[PDB]
Each structure stands twice: as structure tokens, then as C-alpha cells.
Amino acid sequence: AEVTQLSNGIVVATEHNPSAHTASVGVVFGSGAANENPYNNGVSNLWKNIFLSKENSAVAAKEGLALSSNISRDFQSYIVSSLPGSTDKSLDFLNQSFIQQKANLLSSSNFEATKKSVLKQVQDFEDNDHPNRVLEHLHSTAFQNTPLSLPTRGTLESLENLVVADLESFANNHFLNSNAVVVGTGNIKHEDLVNSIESKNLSLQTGTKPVLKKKAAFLGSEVRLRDDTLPKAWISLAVEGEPVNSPNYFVAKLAAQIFGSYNAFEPASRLQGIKLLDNIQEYQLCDNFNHFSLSYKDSGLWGFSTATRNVTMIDDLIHFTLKQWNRLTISVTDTEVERAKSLLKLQLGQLYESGNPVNDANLLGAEVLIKGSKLSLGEAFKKIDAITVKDVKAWAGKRLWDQDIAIAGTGQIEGLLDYMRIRSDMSMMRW
Amino acid sequence: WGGFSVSNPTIQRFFALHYLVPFIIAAMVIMHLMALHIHGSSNPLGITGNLDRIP
Ligand code: HEM
């Protein structure tokens, strides 16, 4: 439970844990899909793919190292996992790929083979992963003509028109030192890693800063991807949520826990202490749903996603769900809040403390890049337990009550009513 | 007429009937709306409205 972070020439962040069996090392840059353009959209995802290319991956496999990368909206990460003893050989492969081979990975035979793979990759996503496809379009319409609208995997049209030069241009503008953080998770000590880093000098493009842009903004709107050939309807609906480092960061996440997630086929899920379940189970309004409180640097999204085969009652699904959310402003109970606290801790714990260091790296990296530090799991619980019904009400009355929404859906959505009908349900009539 | 010409019997029965018919018209309007409901309204293009309806 130690969050150590020091700065020499580069900012080093680590979180050591005795028993772990393995150690993960990697660099996390403060720029992701939110930094791209509509035309070079997908460059970051492309970088990730060559970094994991058969060539670069085989070089690490001989050495007994495993590679992992993750492209997000606000950040980007390249991670190498190793045994606690080879904590130095991971750094050799890291530097060898970001300075030495930052020209060998970009060969005309490797690039074309990779491009052909991310194309079949992004295509497969759009053709079959409907729930994530819908969630991606939700960001697209909610944050249209703004940084958060760009999809992480990039679009097919911007991808196929991408060249080696675009990779370089992005790398020379974002893979900078002032826009990076070296992260180490597993079991290795902070002093053990910082020494191996401060050993090898050479700045390489120091003092250089990444380009600036315009602030992200939420726009109440919708995108309907109707497709009657699909056997279900997948929808996602949300309001402007909370950005990371917001006073209500936790109040929002708790609010989403109150309604939680559901799976009609799992006996135990049908028994949860969620009032909404009394309404949706009678006629089986859906196969599943899940609420979320997505947070990013400039903004976020609070809402839910759902999947259903009850195509003639989608209006009841949306109506009952929105009536429940109305409650947060006027009648949420003490016990609902308390149930949420307990469940929020359990989920927040299971995330922050998993038996996998690669997840730890992403969580640590993403946090330190935005606030310059990481809030300890024990510190979070103190904030969570401090939330009162009055807090949730004040939050809901500002973020949910009579506020614009963003909608996205695909499949048999003929039954999903017009925007104004959904929007009207964001409140209730009163004397 | 109820007699040799338009007289008292005539006007009294016409008032009674004037009061009645509006209610028969009301019943006919319901039958009119029932027939309207099974196929819905038409539109200015003269073609199907099934591809884009709003509440
Ligand atoms: C008291 C009299 C009447 C009432 C209350 C009434 C009411 C209605 C209503 C509510 C509609 C739907 C909205 C509209 O299209 O305007 C409708 C449709 C229609 N009515 Fe009437 N109506 C009346 C008399 C008549 C008469 C006299 C005719 C013809 C001789 C008629 C022919 C139609 C037709 C054909 C439609 C369908 C229009 C379309 O969808 O294209 N109605 N009426």
C-alpha cells in the first residue's frame, strides 16, 4: 500500500508489493486518442500494434519478457512484464525500442503487415462487438467535435490512409519526456528502479512540449444505428458525468452503484437490493444492464448501458430506469446509500488490488499523469464512507435532474422512442 | 309535421331530435376513430409511414 514517486530528469512512479511473483515495468504517456485528429485517428492504436508485432515481441520472448500495451483516451501505455530478477532487462528492451528501434519497427514490411491486422481488427469490432461499439458511439455523439469524441481504436477510413510518417509525427510530438511517466509495479523497490534509470543518462528531446487544443464539452444528442437484422437492441444513455479530480468523483461512482449491473440469467443477480429490479423483471424488460461513472481529464459520462430482446417494450425499460434515477434527487434512502458504499468498496478494492501487476501499472500511471500522485485505497474508503444522502441529492439535482442526455443504440431500436420523450423523463411533475 | 302544416308539433319534435342527433354523431365519430386506428393516418407523400413514426 505504498505510493512512492520521485523526479530526477524523468518522473518515476512505483508501487511495490512483497509477494507478487512477477514485476511489470513500462512508460505511460500523457496523451491518447483525445490528442489525435479526425484524420490521423487510430495512430496510437497503430503504435500499440507494432510494439506488439511478431518481430519486437519475439525479441522479448527470447529474453523471457512479456509485452502489453493499452490505448485510452487521456493516456497511452507500453508495458513489459518480467520475473523479479530480470527487472533490469525490461529497461534494456524499453530503451532499445523507444530510441534504438524507433526506426527499425517502422519498416515497410512490418508496417504493412501490422496495418492489415488492425484493419481486420477494427472491422471485426464494428461488425460484432455491439455493446462496446454502442458505448464508443456514445462518446462520439456526446462529445462531438471535441477531443473525447475520437474512438480509441480509430476509424477504418482514417486508418487505411495512415502512413509511417504519421506515426513519426505523432511520436515526435507526444512521446516526449515532459509528457511521460515511467511506472513500475510488482515487487521491485522504488530505489531499485530509479537507480537503473538515473544510471543511463541522455535526455533525448527534452524541454519539448506537446501541442495544445480546445476543451472538451458535452452536447445533448443521439446517434441511432438501427439494424433490424440483429437479434437484440443495445443502448447506452448518459448525462455529463464527473472528470477525474472532481469533488464529486466518488459521489458519482456511488450513485452508479445504487443501480449497479444486472444479468437476467444469473439467479443471484435477480435478488439484488435494487428497486429497479421489481419493475423490469415482471415482463423481463432486458437481458442485462450496467451503470457506470466514466471519468476523464476534462469531463465524464454518468449513465447506463443495456441489452434486450424485448423489442416491443423498450420504452418501459427506459421509463422505469429514468424514474429510478429521478429518485436520487428527491427520495433516495439511507439504506440504498449504505448498500452502495459497501459494494463500491468491494469493487474498488477488486480493481486496485488484483493479482496482476499490468493492471496496477495502468491504474497507477493514469492517476499520476493527471494529479501528480495516487490516492491510496484506504484514503478512498474514507471519502466513500463520508458520503451522505444529502450529498447524493445535491449531486443528482445538478447532474441528473432536467439535464440533457446523450443516446446511442444499435439493433432493433424501432421501439426506442424519440429524444424528447426520453429527455422529458429526466424529471417529474410537481405542485 | 304531426299535422296539416309546420306547426307546434313540428317545432317541439325538431327540438327533441336536435338534442338527440349530436350524441349519435358522437358515436359515429368513435367508429370513425376506430377505423382510423387500425391503419393509422396517411401522409402528404401518399406512401407508407411505417419507416419513420413519432409519438
Ligand atoms: C365530426 C366529424 C369528424 C371528426 C371529429 C373527424 C375526425 C378525424 C380525425 C381525428 C382524423 C385524424 C386527423 C386528420 O387526418 O385530420 C380523421 C381522419 C380522416 N377523416 Fe375524419 N372526422 C370527421 C368527419 C369526416 C368526414 C365528413 C370525412 C369524409 C367525408 C372524413 C374523412 C376522414 C379521412 C378519410 C381521414 C383519414 C385522413 C388521412 O389520414 O389521410 N372525416 N378524422
Side-chain angles (χ1 to χ4, degrees), chain A residues 352-395:
Chain A
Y352 280 41
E353 53 176 79
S354 183
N356 190 351
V358 311
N359 294 159
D360 287 284
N362 284 112
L363 302 179
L364 212 192
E367 264 219 71
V368 295
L369 274 166
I370 309 171
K371 42 202 295 183
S373 60
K374 177 186 177 181
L375 197 67
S376 55
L377 192 63
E379 262 293 292
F381 287 27
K382 286 191 180 180
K383 289 188 175 296
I384 295 178
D385 279 317
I387 302 170
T388 59
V389 166
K390 248 193 175 179
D391 294 329
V392 177
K393 285 188 181 183
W395 176 79

Side-chain angles (χ1 to χ4, degrees), chain A residues 224 315 414-422, chain B residues 52-55:
Chain A
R224 303 164 95 114
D315 60 301
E414 179 183 85
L416 178 70
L417 268 31
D418 57 290
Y419 187 86
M420 285 306 256
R421 261 289 195 105
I422 313 304
Chain B
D52 192 43
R53 332 280 307 204
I54 51 181

Side-chain angles (χ1 to χ4, degrees), chain A residues 10-11 23 53 62 66 105 117 123 125 146 152 167 174 184 197 200 224 228 253 265 271 284 299 333 418:
Chain A
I10 314 170
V11 49
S53 176
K62 285 285 186 180
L105 295 173
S117 287
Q123 177 180 308
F125 177 70
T146 264
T152 62
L167 284 279
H174 303 284
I197 296 175
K200 310 170 185 179
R224 303 164 95 114
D228 297 349
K253 248 149 195 301
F265 302 93
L271 307 168
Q284 203 54 83
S299 189
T333 68
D418 57 290

Side-chain angles (χ1 to χ4, degrees), chain B residues 3-24:
Chain B
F4 298 142
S5 66
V6 166
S7 44
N8 186 235
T10 318
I11 306 298
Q12 298 208 284
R13 76 189 49 185
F14 282 3
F15 169 58
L17 259 12
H18 182 51
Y19 201 136
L20 205 219
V21 193
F23 296 104
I24 295 175

